[PDB]
Design a binder for this molecule. Sequence first.
Ligand SMILES: *[C@@H](C(=O)O)[C@H](O)C(=O)N[C@@H](CC(C)C)C(=O)NCCCCNC(N)=[NH2+]
Length: 220
Amino acid sequence: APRSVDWREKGYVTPVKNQGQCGSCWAFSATGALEGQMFRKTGRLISLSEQNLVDCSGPQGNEGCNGGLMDYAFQYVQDNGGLDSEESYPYEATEESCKYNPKYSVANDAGFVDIPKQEKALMKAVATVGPISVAIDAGHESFLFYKEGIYFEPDCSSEDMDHGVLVVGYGFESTESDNNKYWLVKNSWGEEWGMGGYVKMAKDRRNHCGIASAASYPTV
Ligand SMILES: *[C@@H](C(=O)O)[C@H](O)C(=O)N[C@@H](CC(C)C)C(=O)NCCCCNC(N)=[NH2+]
């Protein structure tokens, strides 16, 4: 595979969004991966509605601001036959009744693919598919205060993940410890967090923070 990948340079990735004080990370991760695969199919990048997922994907297993899973979001889009755009169904950071309108649907998918639980498999998927939905352990103060460099937290768990994000690429940079590889991750905490809203997560360090443990993308 390539040593470095960045799908933002190829037009696959919308700007960084902000989930607010709602536990809806799974919906931002899902819309990010589906935005990528829709662009791959149509050549058109359209920001998609996280609120649509928060309000409407309960029957697939999601629980709004109380949590969810990207795969359940992908199933909703397939079962529902569409997903509205961000502009038509804007984000309110609170769960309300479903207001989906098929006339304003701009995305579809036909299922999803779960990646095997190995960083080598995640790398191949990122290199060849596009941005990938992933789950990480983000419950540490060091993650809140991250400003730059490669994020490594010795107390991170590879099995207890609590936050959905989007891998948009990977790369390397020289460091003191010679642990130089990183996943390029888009978060949903606005652009004032981290590096304009992004984090470089340690790559090839024993599946750090579980980044390869629940990875998937939608089939368009
Ligand atoms: C994430 C956030 O808003 O920061 C939000 O709390 C969330 O959805 N968390 C998920 C974890 C994923 C990695 C996003 C969560 O804890 N809920 C998942 C419930 C699904 C139940 N089934 C299984 N298999 N866990």
